[PDB]
Amino acid sequence: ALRRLRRDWALHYLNNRFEPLFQRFPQARAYLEALRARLARYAETGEP
Amino acid sequence: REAQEAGFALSTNGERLELTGPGPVPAELSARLEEVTLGSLAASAELEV
């Protein structure tokens, strides 16, 4: 559950960071989401 | 201001922010404290940029 929390709060932060980027670059929807998961995994499993 | 009006004391350490006070922190107050902390660190992000 703690690991899941360290991912839920990560997404809560990343949505706020990514909203202006999604608004500015809709064509990069696939790319920007790809970071959103990846950074989350960095918060989740500590994978470099 | 919103913490003192809510009966909680804000103990800042620069970027790090925490609240000390009797009873549980209200959901609005805790969410807004998280908001202020993330906003400060995002301002630090755009400072690095």
TrEMBL record, chain A:
Which species is listed as the source?
Meiothermus taiwanensis
The protein's name is endopeptidase La
UniProt similarity note: Belongs to the peptidase S16 family.
Shown residues in whole-protein numbering: 197 to 244 of 719
Q: List the gene name.
A: lon_2
